[PDB]
RNA sequence: AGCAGAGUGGCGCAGUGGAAGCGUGCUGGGCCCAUAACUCAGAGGUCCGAGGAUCGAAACCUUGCUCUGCUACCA
RNA sequence: AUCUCUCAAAUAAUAACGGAGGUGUCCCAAGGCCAGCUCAGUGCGGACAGAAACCACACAUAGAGCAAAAGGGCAAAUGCUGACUUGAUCUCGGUGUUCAGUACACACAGGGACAGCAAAAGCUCGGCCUAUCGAUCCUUUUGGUUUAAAGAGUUUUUAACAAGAGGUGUCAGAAAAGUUACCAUAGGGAUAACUGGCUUGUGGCGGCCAAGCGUUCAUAGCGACGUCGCUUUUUGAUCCUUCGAUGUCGGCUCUUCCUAUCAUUGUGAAGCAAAAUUCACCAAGCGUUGGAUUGUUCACCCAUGCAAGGGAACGUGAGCUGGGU
RNA sequence: GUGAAGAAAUUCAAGUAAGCGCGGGUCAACGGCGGGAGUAACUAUGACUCUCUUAAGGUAGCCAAAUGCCUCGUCAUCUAA
RNA sequence: GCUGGUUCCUUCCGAAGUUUCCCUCAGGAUAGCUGGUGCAUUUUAAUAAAUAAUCUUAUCUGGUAAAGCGAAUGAUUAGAGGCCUUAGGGUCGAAACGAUCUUAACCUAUUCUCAAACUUUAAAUGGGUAAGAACCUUAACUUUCUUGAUAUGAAGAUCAAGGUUAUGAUAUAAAUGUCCCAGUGGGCCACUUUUGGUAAGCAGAACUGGCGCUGUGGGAUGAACCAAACGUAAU
RNA sequence: GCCAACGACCAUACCACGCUGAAUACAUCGGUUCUCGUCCGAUCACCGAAAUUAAGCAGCGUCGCGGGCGGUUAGUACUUAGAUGGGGGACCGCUUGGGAACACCGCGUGUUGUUGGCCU
């Protein structure tokens, strides 16, 4: 784009995906950093949402000043079991209005458990 | 200043007419043609290894080739004037059947049967083909609504 | 640029199987006199005719259709095939690395 | 180079385009295709009238502008400024076919005896079938004597023979005047700017029902 | 020198003076340019049709030697 | 958005919507050479569900595809197999089923006996002489991926060991270590005799009682211990080699017009009057306020 | 009518796809009894317009605008 | 030579120095083929986060990509990514469009082989198809391990057959710079300068409606913006006639006819008081000049004039003149 | 002509003079002999100042010359004009 | 390869002005047309159940008119409908985050017109094959085969059954191999269809008819216009 | 009346929305030791069933979009053929016979192959 000296094929960033039996603990290590009464948006209408943090040391790790400080963004994806029909190899179909989520479904799930009030700010 | 050469002039011919693009049917990969099953040569846009070139498309022909996945035809085209035969090789999905034989074969088996019913009374064959004729001389009651019934125009002014 | 592999396995006219071959050039093979044409053009210009057989101007092609002799490694047979009209050329290949950015 | 008017009485060159391929096209100055109170509703102007010709006559771009200005000045001096809706129904997309003859001054000295004969654009023209309505006015019923007795001075800018129609439609809509009344009365004609709505029944229910609501309440 | 050229005029009329004439007509047409063999496989079978009265009926009793053909009705 | 977007749309056909074929494999599967005219190509079909794995034999014609032979895991209850209907062990006997069922159809029960004592043998059967040319068979993988170790090859394995005739290679077998064979031919003896599953019962025999409450459940409901699995297969295989029952069924019948059942489609008299039942309500909802 | 082309910092030019290049003016101070010269330092760019292709175009491409060149005919 | 889109009137074919363009390259992957996996965009998003990056989720009928122009095809591919490999192979002859149904070339289907991926069926005899290119003579490789050198060997040389390549872009193939006002020839109207001829963008030439001007007053005289029409003085056009010759530009002398009228006879109009002058109808009867420079038509003067208008067979060289040309 | 290989025709080697290139000299030898902005208490100018680039920049004199497209140049005079 | 002349009569027949190739573009070869020379033969040749050409019957075949923009591809005129929050001016407000219009965006419904290089359908004229005895069904034989166990299938030879041969209207006769046979390879015009140009008795063409080759009766006249296409004669 | 597998014709079969679904099932769901790919046992893969009829799928409803198909538009438009037919040309009127279309109105919303199996 020439605006930042960055080009094609740069290996510019790092990412990953985590699902099942490991995501539920790293999120709650972030909710104390998130002060989990989170703002309103912070939210998409798909029923999944995410946030971004500074000071990635405070989830119970050693600082180790040879590594550097890092601000991070996160995105957790909720769902309904059966959603793989859009992503299975065979007999693969869409959803409809249900069981497809809205923004309220996560906002229910954010406020019912973990008690994250919506902060309509 | 050009035809000369090899696929020029294929505006509406050689493509697929509307709402039939994408993946080929699989009916036409199944068909079978003996020697003498008279067949057509036409255009296609879904087997891009082979074509009949710019002049042929829209002509039909005999088959005297039986091969792996090809058909070799005899076909008449106009030179001025030595109208010759041509032997064209083509993958099968360019090709549709004649149905012009396909009336004539049931012109056969009726005649083998309608003579077979004629083989019990004798007369008469009546077995050739005749189009519509001068019909008759009816008399026609109204029967339905006597005459006048008078549509006479007046329509110009608008 | 035409990268080519240094080794390839093609038809060998002697072993009648596919075996590894080597590939080299043709370069020019200077006109070794006194050959049959050479003993005629040198014949008909012992003096005072002046350049009858026409020596040729009017250059046309910007590059020549290069050829590569294909020596079999096994039974030392050599063969021939053209390759298409490209100005740049190299053997060995320096194999292209797909998907990498230009460094620095 | 603004060649005289006699050279294009016949559409005999090809139906031309205006392309995204050839750059160099000059300006058609007709930036207005309708005059009068364009902010009027349909109820403001019940009357309609066109102006039409009787050939396959090619029509030049220039008298369209005269057709704009000449009937404008009569209608602003006779029956109020906003009491009509002038419409010139026609766009000159067609191009004329010119080599410009600025071959003077000596420093150039070859171009063309007639080798070769390509074209350049200088203006536009318009192509007219039989009965193609061109210049039309949507006004009230009390100015029929105003428009046609101004339409004289626009017929004598559009060439040849031209007849004059008085419509039986209710303004510029696609509906006859006596036809206009009875289907308007309940819901079936819903008013808009220059037009109405044809048959809100299909569909499927609520648009008929929302139109059912406001006419009752 | 641009006089008049390229033109197909009268040229058709002079072709329909001798009739337009589909090539000849033939019965046992040539066999060339095909599958080259297939063609010589017939050459074996062209050596095979020896019987009209002698071996044509000998196999028919040998048809019943295998009590008919009840099994292979699909293959 | 997308109003006129429906107008220029067209589809991919029907089985692409419901995700059944691909049209890319099957066309170049059933690409018959045209020199042979209508000698069938006779491919073999294997499909699978979460509870069942299926085996079909079919061929194409002009109108469609006649399916001469069929199989299910539903028949294996007649052959002593109660549970585990999605095993590679279970994959073997299913391909073994039709492998002699066709031999009853064409009468080739004697010849082409196939691989008898299976311990994981790469046995392509030989084309015999002086008589019946053997009925060839071709393999489809449907839509699943043909990776080294797919269970669809296990349906081929009982088919090729029963006497069927396939151009068959071995590099896609489970247990044949891709880096690098080293054909451990005895791994199918652990596969076909279910030992790869039977160890998992034994390696969870003493660790979790809840393991049996989890998967390989209902083996405890029938007392199926982790010892006797292969002999259930071996006794089934000779019984498969005895006779397939050719699915005789004579209920005949409780089927027809029960009960209606699927909402016959409301013709023009009950369409517009349903609208007329709905049109008069909306003027009544306005006549209520005045 | 092809074409040699050019149009870049106030002005002049240099720049063959990774940079905005040099010089003079212009701008500030020191040096001056005060002005110049002298000394240090700063500032100065839709690279003629619209597009093309691409990892990036002042340069590569053609396209129009401005402007010489440069000989030719004769809607 | 050569490629597309039209030009093309719905088979094909096809025109001009008609329109829009393109090509003499490029690629060991941009090829061969199995494997997974779907882009143009756009919505809601998410520390630093816009035109900013990156991840996520929905809508995504192809609005992309496919080396290059333009068409066409293209959706678990013919694209993205990945694996692995050389069919860009040897070989035999036919067949497709160029047309005389030739040759080159390029595609296409085989038969035989040797293989290459894929589990198989299959797919592959180069770029997804319409371009991406050449004949003898030789030079020259690669060739059987090949015959010929004519008396007989041996050995080297050349010579031959067979596949390519070095080469012919004016593309079926000569090796190729000028000008003759000293120029001498066969001829040509198949081909101009001159004279006539149909045509009129050009220009002289009127009509119409009136936006306005004319102190007021649209129309006395004017008439813009636009509307549509005749002549042949030129100005080009075109090539129809004369190339075995039509003596081709001016002025002098000199008959003539012509109205679209300058002024004289008879009127009418007016912003026509008169004098003066303008408009417009009818009207070719006599009139339309003497000079400075130039070779002139015009141009521009000086003067007469109570006042100086346009035009015709290029009017006219066996009447001249020859100043230009 | 001299060397080396080679059975030999032949293969190269060492060589290698004059020419052209290479180094100067020369135009009473052919033939050449630029533009750009800025700049003076009116304007106009350009005595000047900067920059560009060449083998060096038309110098002393002439002139719309018999030689200036623009031409029927701009200005007095000869002329009734 | 360029011009002039190329000498006796009647009878018969009667063209070319095109494609390619060529340092060709005024000429030659080339096919084309024509003429000659016979020769083989049809119950389509000698005191039809077999053909070859125009319509029918049936069957495929194309995007040109005509349309078509309330589909794409564009280009394109008018306002309207708006929660709008893209929001430009504001406004009641410290701004408004309260509220209020307006104006730019936007969507929704439309609307005026258009297309040689845009297509969702789509003509007449004209393309193409077919309208049987060289058949049509039926047997079991053949296969040295890559295919397939009926050692299927495909094609081949050979028996079995078979009406009157299968649309109309004709055939002034059909059917072929040489000489590559003399010429000719410059054309012209009208109607529609039509580019180039403002255009023309100009050029540039596709499909016919005619002129050159052709007199002729008729618009006085005039190669083409419209009647009709020319053995000697009377009506 | 359905369900599966394989299809075939490939929108009357689609999409948006709403509703239902007996059985057979299809699915959903569950685990990770081996085959096995994986950043990630979610997609893939191996094991098999606790729970489920919500979705998917099927069936149906909507003066639903869409598409199929009929009827009118309309003998209109264009048109092969013909003329001593007009018009200043432009263009149109007749004789000769083929003859449309979008719009506009209505009807319809998958038919089916074989292979099983289910039985409201």
Kindly describe this structure.
This is part of a larger assembly, with chains A (121 residues), B (158 residues), C (104 residues), D (217 residues), E (75 residues) and F (290 residues). Chain A has 121 residues and is α+β, with helices and mostly antiparallel strands. Helix content of chain A is 18%, strand content 8%. In chain A, strands 1-2 form a two-stranded antiparallel sheet. The two termini of chain A are 35 Å apart. Chain B is an alpha+beta fold and 158 residues long. In chain B, a hairpin with a 6-residue loop joins strand 4 (76-77) and strand 5. Chain E is mostly helical. In chain E, 21% of the residues lie in helices and 0% in strands. Chain E has helices at 36-45, 58-63. The longest helix of chain E has 10 residues, at 36-45. The termini of chain E are far apart. Chains in contact: A-C, A-F, B-E, B-F, D-F, E-F. Chain B binds chain E through residues 64-67, 72, 76, 80-81, 83-85, 87, and chain E through 11-12, 15-16, 18, 20-23, 29, 31, 33-35, 38. Chain F binds five RNA strands through helix 1, strand 1, strand 2, strand 3 and strand 4.
Question: Which helices and strands occur, and which strands form pairs?
Answer:
The structure is cut from a larger assembly and holds chains A (121 residues), B (158 residues), C (104 residues), D (217 residues), E (75 residues) and F (290 residues).
Chain A: H1 23-34, E1 49-53, E2 72-76, H2 103-112
Antiparallel strand pairs in A: 1-2
Chain B: E1 39-41, E2 59-63, E3 70-74, E4 76-77, E5 84-85, E6 89-91, H1 100-118
Chain F: H1 25-29, E1 43-48, E2 53-60, E3 65-69, H2 88-105, E4 138-139, H3 152-161, H4 187-192, H5 195-202, H6 209-213, H7 229-242, H8 268-287
Helix pairs in contact in F: 2-3, 2-7
The structure holds 5 RNA strands.
